[PDB]
């Protein structure tokens, strides 16, 4: 891949993926600038970033950095399109693409995609797990796992890349193309992002657009939408049902079938519910397109217990239970995640980078928590809250100190939850990291 030789390369925006996306071009040969929001001696990213040689730009978005000969922009995902950093490249004709396109240019393993509105990480999970089992080699990538600039590069052609992604991420592709993609469902979503309900589904589409009649898109024949879009791919469709029989997977007499193969019972599923039949219909098919044999994808699926940094739940230290939620990187996620529990036996940790905004949404869903444990460039604003919210807090240097320090004040019956309302980034690589330090605590505390 000679493709970035000696070419320049602009950044916009760090986040999970913008440090990979800048390493791996400049491994490449690329000429790599990285544009931040975030005042430099705030990011801690930007720094080694420029002790690697990198160019950086932080604290502003000069539209006059456009104006050098660029050849591409790599930007966040996240950043609507309505940016001006964005509408300027578009503008100047300077390619606009998210970093899975690089991943994908570079890859020689497999690609497994899957996105969808809702059901995109215990369904990547379950196929993940499921190929695994069955002696393929599936690594998760994408928005689980790691970036898929940085998985890439681990990856060989044995291996099977199954990433995670999202209509944001889909809005930058090109030449990107899964041989085996999956869109669990539509329905309405980010419509402040994407504007029309059209433009979202329009999005996530871009996945088959490479895609022939060779490779395989497998959606959601409960949704009459699915059955329209079917018409305009050159994918081959295997649809999955939970109405009818169909092409694919689907349910019959309370078992799971694949093109008339029996696979497994309904109710043996390892996690319950009907959103989950639809996960696991999904991925039987991808693992019957990727030849997994029977009785392994109903071995995988019955003993599957969840997804990890999810309201994962970990055991048992004398009588308190402990919760890694590090997947919880927005106040929406930990108001969720929060639902489930009586806050008076709870002790959250909370707290990580600084986007600016305030807490003060998060108030109702806080009021009545045991306590806080508060850490990362934020504390200070998630504080600000817990006084607010009449819940007592403290400080805690990084994750392990603060379940070390939720620990010793809980009680039989009390549960320690981490669901930061914040992104990683100040402290740690991703969230991933993050809940792997909560887990390491944990196990230290639990002996083993
Ligand atoms: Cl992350």
Same mark, same amino acid.
């Given at each position: 891949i000679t493709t970035f030789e000696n070419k320049k390369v602009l950044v916009l925006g760090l986040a999970r993926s913008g440090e990979a996306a800048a390493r791996l071009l400049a491994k490449l040969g690329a000429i790599v600038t990285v544009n931040d929001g975030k005042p430099f001696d705030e990011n801690p990213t930007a720094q080694s970033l420029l002790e690697e040689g990198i160019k950086v730009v932080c604290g502003s978005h000069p539209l006059e950095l456009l104006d050098e000969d660029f050849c591409y922009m790599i930007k966040n995902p996240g950043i609507p399109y309505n940016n001006p950093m964005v509408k300027k490249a578009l503008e100047k004709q300077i390619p606009v693409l998210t970093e899975v396109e690089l991943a994908y240019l570079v890859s020689e393993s497999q690609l497994i995609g899957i996105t969808g509105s809702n059901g995109k990480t215990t369904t990547t999970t379950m196929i993940a797990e499921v190929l695994n089992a069955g002696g393929q080699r599936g690594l998760l990538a994408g928005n689980i796992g790691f970036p898929a600039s940085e998985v890439v590069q681990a990856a060989n052609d044995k291996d099977t890349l199954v990433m995670e992604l999202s209509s944001f991420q889909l809005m930058g592709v090109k030449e990107f193309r899964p041989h085996i993609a999956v869109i669990t469902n539509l329905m309405p979503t980010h419509?402040?992002?994407?504007?029309?309900?059209?433009? $979202?589904?329009?999005?996530?589409?871009?996945? *088959?657009? *490479?895609?022939?009649?060779?490779?395989?898109?497998?959606? +959601? &024949? =409960? *949704?009459? %939408?699915?059955?329209?879009? !079917?018409?305009?791919?050159?994918?081959?469709?295997?649809? &999955?049902?939970?109405?009818?029989?169909?092409?694919?997977? $689907?349910?019959?007499?309370?078992?799971?079938?694949?093109?008339?193969?029996? %696979? @497994?019972?309904?109710?043996?599923?390892?996690?319950?519910?009907?959103? =989950?039949?639809?996960?696991?219909?999904?991925?039987?098919?991808?693992?019957?397109?990727?030849?997994?044999? +029977? *009785?392994?994808?109903?071995?995988?699926?019955?003993?599957?217990?969840?997804?990890?940094?999810?309201?994962?739940?970990?055991?048992?230290?004398?009588?308190?239970?402990?919760?890694?939620?590090?997947?919880?990187?927005?106040?929406?996620?930990?108001?969720?995640?929060?639902?489930?529990?009586?806050?008076?036996?709870?002790?959250?940790?909370?707290?990580?980078?600084?986007?600016? =905004?305030? &807490?003060?949404?998060?108030?109702?869903?806080?009021?009545?928590?045991?306590? @806080?444990?508060?850490?990362?460039?934020?504390?200070?604003?998630?504080?600000?809250? !817990?006084?607010?919210?009449?819940?007592?807090?403290?400080? !805690?240097?990084?994750?392990?100190?603060?379940?070390?320090? !939720?620990?010793?004040?809980?009680?039989?019956?009390?549960?320690?939850?981490?669901?930061?309302? +914040?992104?990683?980034?100040?402290?740690?690589? =991703?969230?991933?990291?993050?809940?792997?330090?909560? %887990?390491?605590?944990?196990?230290?505390?639990?002996?083993?």
């Open positions: 419509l402040d992002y994407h504007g029309s309900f059209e433009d $979202y589904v329009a999005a996530k589409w871009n996945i *088959q657009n *490479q895609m022939s009649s060779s490779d395989f898109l497998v959606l +959601n &024949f =409960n *949704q009459g %939408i699915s059955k329209e879009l !079917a018409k305009t791919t050159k994918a081959t469709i295997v649809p &999955f049902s939970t109405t009818e029989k169909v092409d694919g997977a $689907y349910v019959q007499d309370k078992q799971l079938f694949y093109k008339g193969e029996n %696979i @497994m019972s309904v109710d043996d599923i390892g996690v319950p519910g009907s959103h =989950n039949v639809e996960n696991a219909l999904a991925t039987i098919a991808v693992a019957k397109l990727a030849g997994i044999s +029977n *009785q392994v994808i109903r071995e995988t699926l019955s003993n599957f217990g969840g997804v990890k940094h999810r309201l994962q739940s970990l055991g048992k230290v004398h009588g308190i239970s402990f919760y890694n939620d590090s997947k919880s990187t927005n106040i929406l996620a930990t108001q969720k995640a929060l639902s489930g529990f009586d806050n008076t036996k709870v002790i959250l940790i909370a707290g990580g980078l600084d986007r600016g =905004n305030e &807490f003060d949404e998060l108030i109702p869903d806080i009021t009545g928590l045991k306590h @806080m444990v508060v850490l990362g460039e934020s504390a200070s604003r998630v504080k600000r809250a !817990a006084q607010k919210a009449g819940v007592t807090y403290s400080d !805690a240097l990084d994750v392990r100190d603060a379940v070390h320090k !939720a620990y010793e004040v809980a009680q039989q019956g009390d549960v320690i939850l981490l669901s930061p309302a +914040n992104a990683s980034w100040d402290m740690y690589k =991703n969230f991933e990291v993050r809940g792997d330090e909560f %887990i390491d605590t944990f196990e230290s505390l639990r002996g083993e």
